[PDB]
Paper text:
Cv2.3194, a resilient class 1 anti-RBD antibody, remains active against Omicron sub-variants up to BA.2.86. To define the epitope of Cv2.3194 at atomic level and the antibody’s interactions with the RBM, we crystallized the Cv2.3194 Fab in complex with the RBD from ancestral SARS-CoV-2 (RBDWu) and BA.4/5 (RBDBA.4/5) strains and determined their structures by X-ray crystallography. The structure showed that the antibody binds to residues within the RBM and the buried face of the RBD. The buried surface area (BSA) of Cv2.3194 upon binding is ∼1000 Å2, with the IgH variable domain predominantly contributing and the CDRH3 accounting for one-third of the IgH BSA.
Cv2.3194 but not Cv2.1169 strongly bound to the BA.4/5 spike and RBD protein. In agreement, Cv2.3194 but not Cv2.1169 maintained RBD-ACE2-blocking and in vitro neutralizing activities against BA.4 and BA.5. In contrast, Cv2.3194 efficiently neutralized BA.4 and BA.5 in the S-Fuse assay with IC50 of 29.1 ng/mL and 21.9 ng/mL, and IC90 of 345 ng/mL and 166 ng/mL, respectively. The Cv2.3194 Fab-RBDBA.4/5 crystals diffracted to 2.65 Å, and we refined an atomic model to a final Rfree of 0.23. Structural alignment of the RBDs from the two crystallized complexes showed the same binding mode for Cv2.3194 (root-mean-square deviation of 1.1 Å across 1646 atoms corresponding to VH and VL). Most of the differences between the two structures were found in the CDRL1, which adopts a helical turn in the complex with RBDBA.4/5, moving slightly away from the RBD. Cv2.3194 IgL variable domain formed fewer hydrogen bonds upon binding to RBDBA.4/5, thus allowing conformational changes in the CDRL1. The residue F486 was also buried at the epitope rim, and mutations that reduced the residue surface, such as F486V in the Omicron variants, could further decrease the affinity of Cv2.3194 for the RBD. Pairing Cv2.3194GL IgH with mutated IgL (Cv2.3194VH−GL) did not rescue SARS-CoV-2 Omicron binding and neutralization, whereas Cv2.3194VL−GL combining mutated IgH with GL IgL conserved binding and neutralizing activities of parental Cv2.3194. Together, these data indicate that Cv2.3194 recognizes an epitope in the RBM, bears VH somatic mutations crucial for its activity against BA.1 to BA.5, and partially or completely loses its neutralization activity when viral variants acquired combined RBD mutations at positions L455 or F456, N460 and F486.
Numbering used by the authors:
A (entry chain L): 1 to 210
B (entry chain E): 333 to 368, 372 to 527
C (entry chain H): 1 to 135, 138 to 219
Write the structure that this text describes.
Amino acid sequence: EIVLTQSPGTLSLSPGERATLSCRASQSVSSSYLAWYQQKPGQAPRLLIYGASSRATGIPGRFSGSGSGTDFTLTISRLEPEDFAIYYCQQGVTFGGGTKVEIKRTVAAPSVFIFPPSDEQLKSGTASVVCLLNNFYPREAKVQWKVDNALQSGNSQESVTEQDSKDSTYSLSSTLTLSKADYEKHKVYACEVTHQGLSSPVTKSFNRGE
Amino acid sequence: TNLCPFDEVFNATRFASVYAWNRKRISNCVADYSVLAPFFAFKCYGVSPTKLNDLCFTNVYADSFVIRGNEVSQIAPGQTGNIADYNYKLPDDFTGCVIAWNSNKLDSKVGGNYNYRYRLFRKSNLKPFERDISTEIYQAGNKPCNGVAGVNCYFPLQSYGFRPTYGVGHQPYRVVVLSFELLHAPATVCGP
Amino acid sequence: EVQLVESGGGLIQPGGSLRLSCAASGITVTSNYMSWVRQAPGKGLEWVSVIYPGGSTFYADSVKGRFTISRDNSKNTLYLQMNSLRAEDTAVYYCARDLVVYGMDVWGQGTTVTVSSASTKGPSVFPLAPSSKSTGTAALGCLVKDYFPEPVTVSWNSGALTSGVHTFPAVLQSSGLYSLSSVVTVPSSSLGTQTYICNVNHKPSNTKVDKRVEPKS
Ligand SMILES: *[C@@H]1O[C@H](CO)[C@@H](O)[C@H](O)[C@H]1NC(C)=O
């Protein structure tokens, strides 16, 4: 089968700029079968371009497709605030990975907070430690949990909010989960955050029992 | 003892589009199927290839067309897909041979060869050996078209646009289907 | 009006069955390529199945032998029957009309299919108390843990507090239950005077919780 790879994974631009999204095929495909679709959060996909270069009915002139062979490209000439969504290229049965066009803003380092498990939760037998990274940009950030300076892997889950509609920032929340027994077997609990806006990784920690 | 005009079918200059596949009838001759390396697809059903030189049939049908590479697998009994459904269908009890070979150096043009086409839209599947050359506008909605292409009204055929830079799966392949008909008349096509 | 209205999706146990329906308007299902395409949570678009105008059916490898696409001309509706449902089949499923050369132009609104072996459970709302040092902004929140199914609604001070609030998308724990968190940043000076209460509402279990979050000592 053919494999369509979209680039870049995320496009960081400002309203009014020009967006250029590439779709590269593993084999040379007839340009009659390639389409570009737009999708907003909570909505169904929306056909933008068909036959590589033909606009569907009801698509502004700022969208235009071009290319052939193994390289196709969708260009949005004048980016408008409604145009910030995810975009997929599709050839027959195959779909591309998708490209997210986001609002571009200046680099903002996250504010990092750590929350120990509540006593009520400890009464149940499970300890959830929480690390909050607030209002950062860009979205790429790494959270490393340390228990008594031992790096924890495979016992945590993180979640990211959508880009905030006011300051165009992201917020992340990681949750480390242990048993109460394993929780009371150690003292220092830390989360270390690496992000582009930080001169050095920021470590926020606490000691079990103040 | 005249010979069968297989050179007229295989070595022909121009092949037809698969939707309007050509059929050459063959009778009253001697055929050397053993003569028939560059042939890269030679699949016989209901009969072994060698024994064809020792058989006699009432008639032989040589159906010729051009498709793309990854569609040659559809030229076989009991297959599905755009070609087998809406262009050229072999019967489930097919007794014959499908021959196919790459013709990239003959049917691909820089900039596209749009002469070869295949039927894309059709409401029902073709019967075996059915031939549909209708170019009427296809009605996909609950409203008529009247020869007007538009919303829910499409041209039923689509061009391949073969280019030399396409992959071998999308490159043009020439296909000849040999069907052996055993009617109730004295056999006219025989072997050596 | 040319559109597609889908229905029939809900909660299924692993190994169960479910039949999604897609009523068409303006287009005839039997004279069109009709596709089912799914999107897993947070993932991209995946083609599931197609039925040709002539009746030929094709399926993705991950659903062969388990999924069957069909249609009814008398009601002009596409159908997707799913058997032996697995945990990877949880997704939003769309029906679309594939014009092949002219792209997939007409889509449905999508229907959600969740497949898990998991009973309706109310959430446990725990506080995430602000730090005692607070190196001039403080963060405080609520942890809505171990609930099922989606969704839960979280407000702050019964809707009075909106600025600085971040309600994070829920994660699916290995236990099969969901876990969410909602934080808010306030001035450090307001911790001693202002009181903060998070209001969590889980309609599937009729569970309303009002949890006060205060500095711990
Ligand atoms: C086509 O011509 C070649 C000689 O160039 C010959 O060997 C071959 O047999 C011909 N094809 C057929 C079907 O006879």
